[PDB]
């Protein structure tokens, strides 16, 4: 079969419809329109954006297809260098730190890192406690200033302290600053800027590196774990520029896609006070002590169904590439040469209807009571196989954490009645979403 293929701008081609704000959203409306597979060009490009369970199956088959740089990951390489989200596969660094760090982003190894989220959370619950009456929340701000802190602290042992500030440490303003030049390039002075922003970024965790080796202090976080870790297969060590990748990579790559799921989360919870009032039905049934421990977490499968769902509708991360290893046949009617991109668009995969059944607009979390019901690939949040999230479980024991302690400590309003508007960086969040909370007065 000969692949449909979008409105065309001239010489141009394909390229103008990604000059805009919204490129996913505007991506799913395409989806829509032509349907599970379509052929998207730019001046020297071609790839194909995939939206069917159909045919992500096979882009999934490992065996032929692999991880490819681009979008996300190539503009990101100029951050992250050649940490695990921004490298190939077949570079040598992929496999070590791949080797080495998959340890310690185990469910085993939350129990470590449990306190030091469990840290960050109650900030936020004592933030929250704390407005006065008429006070009101600011969601992604808020839900930012924690993932950041969370991975600060897990991630490097350093306190970022958003929570004492309305500006954010230099760091974050230098990240996110970066993070926006890299993406902003996605169609085309300030070069200076991102050279500076960079060198803030080296410096200071290249310091955090340093004094920890000239200290010898040994403590909980994946930064004593990647000083202390040798490759299985190599018998080598990471060196001290790229464990300051991957520890960048760990703070540009996972914060912003998990402070997305917990806004969308308690988004889609205040817009269904049924869906709320049961999940807040179990945070107070299992959340019993003062402070959450490792355990009570992994009790709280209602609140994990919701994640899931959140997850479902608005993947945070929301697109990943392959390229094909050979030559092959995809679908049993498209044939694929060696090199041939393609686009997995994951929030239209999650719209499946032969995979969900016809309600896939609706929040139901309850979708995900039995999670083998799902046939393969058709929920793709974290990618895929070898090249999937490493933080994945990182980012469920965190916003289940969070989600949890929110639910059991306050009620919610949605008092200015919210209409969605979803803005995109590199991932996706409810913009201006905004809530007033009403404390239990459950002490902590
Ligand atoms: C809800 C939150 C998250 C979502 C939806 C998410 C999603 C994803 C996706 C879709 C990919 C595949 C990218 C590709 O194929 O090009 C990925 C890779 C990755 N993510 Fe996440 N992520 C989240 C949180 C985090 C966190 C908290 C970390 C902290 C370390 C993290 C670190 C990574 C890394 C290092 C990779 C590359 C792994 C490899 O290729 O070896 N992510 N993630
Ligand atoms: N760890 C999540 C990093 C990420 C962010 C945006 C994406 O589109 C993606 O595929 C991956």
Not at 107 to 129: F, N, R, S
Request: proline share 6%.
């Amino acid at each position: 079969k000969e692949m449909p293929q979008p409105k065309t701008f001239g010489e141009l081609k394909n390229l103008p419809l990604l000059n805009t704000d919204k490129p996913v959203q505007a991506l799913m409306k395409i989806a829509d329109e032509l349907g599970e597979i379509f052929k998207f060009e730019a001046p020297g490009r071609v790839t194909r954006y995939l939206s069917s369970q159909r045919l992500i199956k096979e882009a999934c088959d490992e065996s032929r297809f692999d991880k490819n740089l681009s979008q996300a990951p190539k503009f990101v390489r100029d951050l992250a260098g050649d940490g695990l989200f921004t490298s190939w596969t077949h570079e040598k660094n992929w496999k070590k730190a791949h080797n080495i760090l998959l340890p310690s982003f185990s469910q085993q190894a939350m129990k470590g890192y449990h306190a030091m989220m469990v840290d960050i959370a109650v900030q936020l619950v004592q933030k929250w406690e704390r407005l006065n009456a008429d006070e009101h929340i600011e969601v992604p701000e808020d839900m930012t200033r924690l993932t950041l802190d969370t991975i600060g602290l897990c991630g490097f042992n350093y306190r970022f302290n958003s929570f004492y500030r309305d500006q954010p440490h230099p760091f974050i303003t230098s990240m996110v600053r970066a993070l926006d030049e890299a993406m902003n390039k996605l169609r085309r002075e300030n070069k200076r800027q991102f050279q500076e922003d960079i060198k803030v970024m080296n410096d200071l965790v290249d310091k955090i590196i340093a004094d920890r080796k000239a200290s010898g202090e040994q403590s909980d976080d994946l930064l004593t774990h990647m000083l202390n870790g040798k490759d299985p297969e190599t018998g080598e060590p990471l060196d001290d520029e790229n464990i300051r990748y991957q520890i960048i990579t760990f703070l540009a790559a996972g914060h912003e896609a998990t402070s997305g799921l917990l806004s969308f989360a308690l988004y889609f919870l205040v817009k269904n006070p049924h869906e709320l009032q049961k999940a807040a039905e179990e945070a107070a049934r299992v959340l019993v002590d003062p402070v959450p421990s490792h355990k009570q977490v992994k009790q709280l499968k209602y609140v994990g169904m919701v994640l899931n769902e959140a997850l479902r509708l608005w993947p945070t991360a929301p697109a990943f590439s392959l390229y094909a290893k050979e030559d092959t046949v995809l679908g049993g009617e498209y044939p694929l040469e060696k090199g041939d991109e393609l686009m997995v668009l994951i929030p239209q995969l999650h719209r499946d209807k032969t995979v969900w059944g016809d309600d896939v607009e609706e929040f139901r979390p309850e979708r995900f009571e039995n999670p083998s019901a799902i046939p393969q690939h058709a929920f793709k949040p974290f990618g895929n196989g070898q090249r999937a999230c490493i933080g994945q479980q990182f980012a469920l024991h965190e916003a289940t954490l969070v989600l949890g302690m929110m639910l059991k400590h306050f009620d919610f309003e949605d008092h200015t009645n919210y209409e969605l508007d979803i803005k995109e960086t590199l991932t996706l969040k409810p913009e201006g979403f905004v809530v007033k909370a009403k404390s239990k007065k459950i002490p902590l």
